Design a protein around this nucleic acid. Sequence first.
RNA 1: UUGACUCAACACGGGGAAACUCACCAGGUCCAGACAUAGUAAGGAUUGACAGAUUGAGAGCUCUUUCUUGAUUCUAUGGGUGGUGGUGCAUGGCCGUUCUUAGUUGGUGGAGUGAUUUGUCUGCUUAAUUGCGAUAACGAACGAGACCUUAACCUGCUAAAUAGCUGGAUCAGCCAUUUUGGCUGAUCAUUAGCUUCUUAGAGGGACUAUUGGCAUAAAGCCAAUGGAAGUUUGAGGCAAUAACAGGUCUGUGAUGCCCUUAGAUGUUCUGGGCCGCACGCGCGCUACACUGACGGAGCCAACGAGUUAUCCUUGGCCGGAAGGUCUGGGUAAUCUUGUUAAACUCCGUCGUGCUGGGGAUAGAGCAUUGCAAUUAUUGCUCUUCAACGAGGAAUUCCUAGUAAGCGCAAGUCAUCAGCUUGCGUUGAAUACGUCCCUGCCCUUUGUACACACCGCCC
Lengths: 101, 53, 216, 65, 92
Amino acid sequence: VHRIRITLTSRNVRNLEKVCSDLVNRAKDKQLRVKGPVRLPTKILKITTRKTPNGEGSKTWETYEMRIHKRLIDLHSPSEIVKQITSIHIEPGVEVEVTIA
Amino acid sequence: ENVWFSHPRKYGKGSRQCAHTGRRLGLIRKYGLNISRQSFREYANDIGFVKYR
Amino acid sequence: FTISKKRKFVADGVFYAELNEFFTRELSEEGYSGCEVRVTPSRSEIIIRATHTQDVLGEKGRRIRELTALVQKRFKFAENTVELYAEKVQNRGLCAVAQCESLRYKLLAGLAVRRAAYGVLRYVMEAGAKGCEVVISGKLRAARAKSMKFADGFMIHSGQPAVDFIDSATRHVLLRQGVLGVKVKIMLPEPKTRQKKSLPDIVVVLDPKEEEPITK
Amino acid sequence: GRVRTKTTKRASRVVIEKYYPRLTLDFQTNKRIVDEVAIIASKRLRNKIAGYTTHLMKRIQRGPV
Amino acid sequence: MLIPKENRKAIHQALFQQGVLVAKKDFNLPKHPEVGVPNLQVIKACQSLDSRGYLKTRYNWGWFYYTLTNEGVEYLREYLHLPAEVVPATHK
RNA sequence: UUGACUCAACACGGGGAAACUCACCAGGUCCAGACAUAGUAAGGAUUGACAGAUUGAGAGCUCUUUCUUGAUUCUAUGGGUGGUGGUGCAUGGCCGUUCUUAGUUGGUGGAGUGAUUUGUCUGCUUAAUUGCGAUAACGAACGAGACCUUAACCUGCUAAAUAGCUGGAUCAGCCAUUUUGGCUGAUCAUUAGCUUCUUAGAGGGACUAUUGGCAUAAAGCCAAUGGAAGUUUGAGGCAAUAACAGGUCUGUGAUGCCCUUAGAUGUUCUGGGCCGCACGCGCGCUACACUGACGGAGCCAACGAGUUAUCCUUGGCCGGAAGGUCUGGGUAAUCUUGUUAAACUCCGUCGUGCUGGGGAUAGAGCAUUGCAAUUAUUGCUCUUCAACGAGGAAUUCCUAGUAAGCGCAAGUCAUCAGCUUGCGUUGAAUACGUCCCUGCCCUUUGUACACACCGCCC
Ligand SMILES: [Zn+2]
């Protein structure tokens, strides 16, 4: 009736994995259909620019990369447990969002 | 309150620029960056544009 | 108000870069050690590290109120939504972003450039750094301009091993003469690195364990 | 050109002089012991060290070095 | 240009109450975000008091910033109303 | 408006330009000359506005003219002050070449009065000062190597109704069918469990193992089975050292110096423009035909992007797909999108003739983007529909999914790709050689050169 979907979008692999491990461990501490992590395709943004501030010089083009990683988690937790786990899952560099309905 | 002084615009140049730039040449609006190429080069690492390859 | 992730991350990066720049221009003599910028609802907190912590803390929190109000008014923040936590320093002599500022301020004080460069080089080596490099670019005495390097210890001029624990700070310092380019390169200690604990060149093996030859 | 480097040469020299009696000529086994003893950063360097080590083993078995 | 006295008094009392204004580097702005009088008047008042001193400017990404001290509030409060005004610059 | 002078200029200053970017020229406002003082004034220092007028005008800049707030200003000094005014021979940051390769800096010792030299190499080998070896050298460091990204080969190690597979409420189409059905599937959050195929956290795997041969039977080299992998597994990134009197003061509230500042080298509105030509030089494009063109039809990919007020687009309907119509999917591997592409192929014509190959070039209307498209944005319906009939001397790139050809995505954009950066498809011949032409490194040697042969000198 009340399914909680939370986002696990970030760029730091280590910290997003740590957040994902923490919530999965809590979801295994209290049985909530033990739904595990789900991995989404990486959204990588490729931009190519020049290096020379002026126009003089050889044709050199620098390509930069910007990739983000998304994960989704579905839980059957009650409101009190949901607010508790979100309180303990405060980490830097991790953006989370919960959709109710 | 000034007439014939600053013409309002909605499209083209004179509508978008950067906070400390706006030369309108060699500037990208990709992903809503709205910054010059030189400024992007200077602060690419801070934003997250790391030369992986 | 909700924005796509591709635009959100790049906008946060631009916002963080703007805050980092704003902190650098506003903070001059307080020994800027860096800024850990993180934004989140329920009283967002941002870490500000500056060497002169006593100068950072104000009388009845006046400086804290000034900086928070200025950021709040600039970025249309609501009341009691943004807060700043002040820290003095971590690895003061190994922190290039503040040691370089101490270098240029001592240079601005009028001390001899070479003697001052030796003094800071002594300061960083005793701080726990295994290698340092001070580069001066521009002109000092006459119209002729020379670039002088004072590398002492070690240096790395390569890829990942020279971008993980290698701290490079470059500043433009004004003077009576033309503008000078100061560059300080410092080794961050090997344990204090992003993810690598040991350099690939450095490698050790286990002890040659042995026992009795017969094993009766 | 498959010329090894001084780091591989020294690393191979130290492991053989430290674990000669229990070393095995088999490539899989000597790669195993190299992994368990060394703190090698990368698998490619570990494999090159193991390959040079086992070549030294065949060289010693053919004649003293 | 003109900078009406009532407008300048309102800006001065607002500055004495808070201390920091947005002060965007803009020309012919639609009034002011902080209910602070139409543009081309407050910026000229700010430059005039900056030249007089006690209120220094700082430029960051095209946004003028100001900060005031004990002499600044005291002089502003004397100009605005009688001595020993209520709102300090050292709240709490 | 300009700068940039073969490698370091000719699709570059990410340069596809109507106003804005525009720094150029003509018409014409605003002072944004802050600050204070010598100083009237306060029977107006002075700003704005209604009527008619000059001026594109609604310029009250102002003029005949009145009315208000009336104490902040100015007749002037100096000085902050803006400057896309100049200096890259003053420089900072960065970038491009030397250098897509292979050296550089010390110390302690030995030689020389000294400048200096060894260490930094007889030999062999590598892309490598990479390594073995002798070695008046020893011990070091930087660089290379090493390190990181990407690309496939594979693991049931916690996975997934934002994606596929099967069962199953859920029904349609006939040759067979009442045990006789195969198949496409329709809905799939109505429901369940799995990731072979989608994704990423960790990883495994190759190290020339393995024998068969050369090399002083070391360092090293060649061929072959297995395997995915042998070129350092491939392709890239960061890259010591010093050299350019190289570029950028028109990216930069980064700035020293010269000059200007009110009749402003300051801000701003309009028109003309950077695209204006009897030419010389470039980088790319079109055909010079049947291998093509036209016309129907079967259809086979990847990387990337998108609305908080205001972008990517679906569906029914009207149309001259050039537009507009209304409910509408999308804050996103849920919607565009499965970007059913192009190339190709089945069939008919053009029959070999600068013709239906090729669309330089001229004219008439049809729409969106943009105060609005003249000096036609852009495409569209057409007609006129030419040179060219594989291009001399010279010159440029290229060693395997390589050139070549084709298409697609993004950048700049209000609109406009013939440019640039990436992707994928079709897919060859030529070598595994050399210093002969053309250059780069090392050693010996000669020198009257040392801004170093674009030298010195008679
Ligand atoms: Zn710029």
